[PDB]
């Protein structure tokens, strides 16, 4: 139930241990006034300091003037911080406004089309995002609701995604969670303690060519539907062959333990792990941080189910793009479909109490 520190060289919610719940919102900007937008970033930063410490925003949730609406909507009263993190990003579309055109980073690349894509335009893109993660769903909803309320008239919610359970790990010392296909997901990631690998593969550097992004990262989001009817009639051997790991322990094929190193040549040539592994991709490595979802039924008698895939990396061109290209022949493609997509530049950390989200850009 403890708090995660809000200030630092980097934003929290990336290398941080993965929390149980997600509420992700993408927003579009409705104001043309640069100064008004800056004022919103400052007000949102102030609110974030309160929320991540388990305090109400502004003057509180009750005990003000009877004839005014409360500053805080009140549904998190009496709850602990619950490891809430709030992570902001800026989409490519933002840079067509406020005179920002020449400051768009090269590393913030538009994704190509991928075979099998079926992207809903309404649940794709966005001028900016807020990733709220916490162990308590009510704490996460409260944060997004209050940020949206504060921004009324300057931003609107484009689309949102809730994740009921995590399917990722930045803590290899703890149990790896399972996705809705029944397999462990997160064994070979990047850990929060691996400072050298984070500098190499996740954090942007000054020399990369965009000074305001130093200490930030780049985010790819992919909404992925799972064909669970089709999966659930596959044999055990078919399921295991698709991944290259066994289902029970999650060990590489032939080996006894989850964390034994994969021997790729023992896997089928189209196995997911074999195609996705850094050694198959010129060393390309990602920080995966996704969550499972279910949004009701499909109207055809079945549960809906999916995975909201999130990856962080130092440059989209050298991270997600080469890996996803190599997945063109993946055995897993028979059972999944990508139906939503977005990319964001995740700025550096809020250094101290005088700093604000986006200060290096603006």
Listed in sequence order, the residues at least 6 apart from 213 whose beta carbon sits closer than 8 Å to its beta carbon are 105, 107, 204, 345, 347, 348, 360
End-to-end Cα spacing for the chain: 35
**Contact partner at residue 187 from ligand HEM, its own copies, none, CB < 5 to 8 Å by partner kind:** ligand HEM
Q: Cα–Cα–Cα angle for 199, 250, 223, nearest 5°?
A: 60
Cα–Cα distance, 312 to 303 (Å, whole number): 30
Residue 187 among known ligand-binding residues: yes
CA-CA-CA-CA dihedral for 339, 280, 195, 173, to nearest 10: 80
Residue 188 among known ligand-binding residues: yes
For its own copies, give the closer residue by CB, 85 or 292: 292
For its own copies, give the closer residue by CB, 116 or 254: 254
Q: Cβ 60 to ligand HEM, closest distance in Å?
A: 19
Residue 282 among known ligand-binding residues: no
Burial class (CB in 10 A: 0-12, 13-18, 19+), 68: exposed
Among residues 24, 37, 95, 309, the one that binds ligand HEM under rule CB under 6 A? 309
**Contact partner at residue 148 from ligand HEM, its own copies, none, CB < 5 to 8 Å by partner kind:** its own copies
**Contact partner at residue 243 from ligand HEM, its own copies, none, CB < 5 to 8 Å by partner kind:** ligand HEM
Cα–Cα distance, 52 to 3 (Å, whole number): 7
Token pair 């800056």: residue: 38
For ligand HEM, give the closer residue by CB, 92 or 262: 262
Residue 338 among known ligand-binding residues: no
Site membership for ligand HEM, residue 293 (CB under 6 A): no
Helix ranges restricted to H, 255-317: 272-276
Restricting to residues 184-203, name those near ligand HEM by CB under 6 A: 184-188
Cα–Cα distance, 324 to 275 (Å, whole number): 9
For its own copies, give the closer residue by CB, 37 or 356: 37
Render the burial of 222-243: b for 16+ CB within 10 Å, e for the rest: bbbbbebeebeeeeeeebbbbb
Restricting to residues 129-168, name those near ligand HEM by CB under 6 A: none
**Contact partner at residue 10 from ligand HEM, its own copies, none, CB < 5 to 8 Å by partner kind:** none
Q: Cβ 332 to ligand HEM, closest distance in Å?
A: 6
**Contact partner at residue 273 from ligand HEM, its own copies, none, CB < 5 to 8 Å by partner kind:** ligand HEM
Q: After which residues is the chain broken (C to N over 2.5 A)?
A: none
Query: Helices 34-51 & 137-150, crossing angle to 10 degrees?
Result: 150
Please report, as ranges, the residues that interact with ligand HEM according to CB under 6 A.
179, 181, 183-188, 222, 224, 226, 243, 245, 262, 272-273, 276-278, 286, 307, 309, 320, 323-324, 327, 336
Known binding-site residues equal 186-188, 272, 288, 309
Known binding positions for heme b: 186-188, 272, 288, 309
């Amino acid at each position: 139930g403890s708090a995660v520190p809000f200030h630092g060289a980097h934003q929290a919610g990336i290398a941080t241990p993965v929390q149980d719940r997600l509420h992700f919102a993408a927003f579009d900007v409705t104001t043309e006034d640069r100064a008004a937008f800056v004022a919103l970033l400052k007000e949102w930063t102030a609110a974030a300091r309160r929320l991540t410490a388990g305090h109400a925003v502004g003057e509180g949730a009750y005990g003000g003037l009877p004839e005014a609406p409360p500053d805080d909507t009140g549904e998190a009263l009496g709850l602990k911080p619950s490891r809430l993190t709030l992570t902001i990003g800026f989409g490519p579309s933002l840079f067509t406004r406020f005179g920002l055109a020449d400051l768009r980073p090269e590393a913030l690349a538009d994704l190509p089309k991928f075979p099998g894509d079926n992207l809903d335009r309404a649940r794709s893109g966005g001028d900016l995002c807020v990733q709220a993660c916490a162990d308590d769903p009510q704490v996460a909803v409260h944060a997004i609701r209050n940020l949206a309320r504060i921004g009324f008239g300057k931003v609107v919610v484009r689309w949102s995604q809730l994740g009921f359970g995590k399917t990722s790990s930045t803590t290899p010392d703890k149990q790896t969670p399972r996705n809705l296909l029944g397999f462990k997901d997160g064994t070979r990631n990047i850990a929060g303690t691996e400072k050298d690998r984070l500098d190499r593969f996740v954090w942007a550097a000054e020399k990369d060519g965009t000074p305001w992004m130093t200490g930030g990262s780049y985010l790819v989001a992919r909404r992925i539907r799972m064909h669970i009817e089709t999966w659930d009639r596959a044999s055990l051997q078919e399921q295991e062959d698709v991944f290259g790991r066994d289902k029970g322990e999650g060990a590489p094929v032939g080996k006894a333990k989850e964390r034994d190193e994969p021997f790729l040549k023992a896997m089928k040539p189209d196995a997911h792990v074999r195609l996705a592994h850094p050694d198959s991709n010129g060393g390309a490595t990602l920080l995966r941080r996704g969550y499972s979802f279910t949004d009701g039924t499909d109207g055809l008698g079945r549960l809906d189910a999916g995975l909201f895939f999130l990856a962080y990396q130092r440059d989209i061109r050298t991270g997600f793009v080469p890996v996803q290209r190599n997945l063109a022949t993946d055995a897993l493609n028979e059972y999944i479909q990508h139906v939503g997509s977005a990319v964001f530049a995740v700025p550096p950390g809020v250094r101290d109490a005088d700093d604000w989200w986006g200060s290096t850009l603006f």
